């Protein structure tokens, strides 16, 4: 697709989020760059309104899957890039086990030479003394799979996954995601076969930053689709060769 | 100059068995040969009037039988890797995993006969001995599977043509069916005997150097233990389909 061409080198990114969780308002900005050829993302986010009323890890997924690396044999399955430059709408509900839920709407598209993700988030039903409003999540992040399927009717995809957030007492807080992505243009797009994105994230800090913030690096790859038959042949050969 | 002596000189220049030398190497090849060679002089003249193929020079120095031994399949190659293993299986009559001189001699005897060429039993042993000298690389007194592949001018691995993209269900099926039809020479719906052998060889060679005949035997039983569902020792289309991840089992 012609969208692929837009992700050939290093591409700048902007992110804007406006949120409200149980009545607490906040805004987050981010900037950085994506490098789809290597599946790599580098971003820094700032709460422009003071202290973040939720933990940074609960926002990682909300805060551009167009920067995933699709191997050459899977280029026909990359919906995210095919909808560029006009972009796509990304919608989610995220359910935090035994606690509240977020609901988000975002538009992801090129604005000039920059890929921009603008989001509106709303959380309700959180416990004040829970893991989220009580800031009991550890500042770290686990690796997950993101399962993607075509939604032929809406000419997009439906996406589902679960994230696991380490809690400070050693237990785990689950977050259940339901996700729809729809193109903004009426041009045609690539509807993939079933697959997933293998995602790894690392959270850190900018040593010079005084404001409440998150530095995030992410590496993502597409997988799970069948290759050419030569792939199964090679793979079987390697296996037969072992121990012998 | 017997073929073995000639080969040994030639192999000093054609170290990668390109089947030619460079034109620069030509003079020094003649120098090695001159250590009546006077036909040498005649030879230079012959086509002095960018490479130099072995058949050219060999045409002028070796016997008509020796030229036959060195080039009888560079002219007319094998059908494919199944015919190759059929020959291998026939002449490794003790299934040693190695072709011996007594076995190679039978191959040459049958080959001469079927090409309608008359030769004496003493000729046949000289040829046996000459052919062994040329092709027994590690000088262990036996021919390995790749040595017979070189005598037979075995062509390229059929499996190399298929591509990593071409993941579509339709593409995988077109490619499965072409692969299966290639190895199923007898058109039975199953790979049996050398059809198995030929597929094992080509598959294993995708990821490792040319395999030995002992290892082919080992990989053949490993493949059967992996995908031989009804354990009858043959690979039905449906068994290979499942093991190559074909979506609809034939
Ligand atoms: Ca033998
Ligand atoms: Ca040998
Ligand atoms: Ca057959
Ligand atoms: Ca069977």
Residue numbers in the entry:
A (entry chain A): 2 to 64, 68 to 248
B (entry chain D): 12 to 46, 56 to 69, 76 to 276
Give the authors' words.
Secretagogin is one such EF-hand Ca2+-sensor expressed exclusively by endocrine cells of the pancreas, adrenal medulla, pituitary, gut, stomach, and subsets of neurons in the nervous system. Secretagogin is built by three domains (denoted here as A, B and C), each comprising a pair of EF-hand motifs.
In contrast, the N-terminal A domain lacks Ca2+ ions consistent with the sequence alterations in both EF-hand motifs. The SNAP-25-derived peptide was bound at the groove formed between the two EF-hand modules of the C domain of secretagogin. Hydrophobic interactions extended on the buried interface of SNAP-25c (155-GIIGNLRHMALDM-167), particularly at residues I156, I157, L160, M163, A164, M167 in the groove formed by the Ca2+-loaded C domain of secretagogin, presenting Van der Waals distances between 3.5 and 3.9 Å to the surrounding residues. The buried surface area of the peptide ligand in the mouse secretagogin was measured as 914 Å2, corresponding to 51.7% of the total surface area (1,765 Å2) of the 16 AA-long SNAP-25c segment within the complex. The R198A mutation impaired secretagogin binding to SNAP-25c. Hence, the C-terminal helix of SNAP25 is expected to be bent or partly unfolded upon binding to secretagogin, which likely prevents its involvement in the SNARE complex.
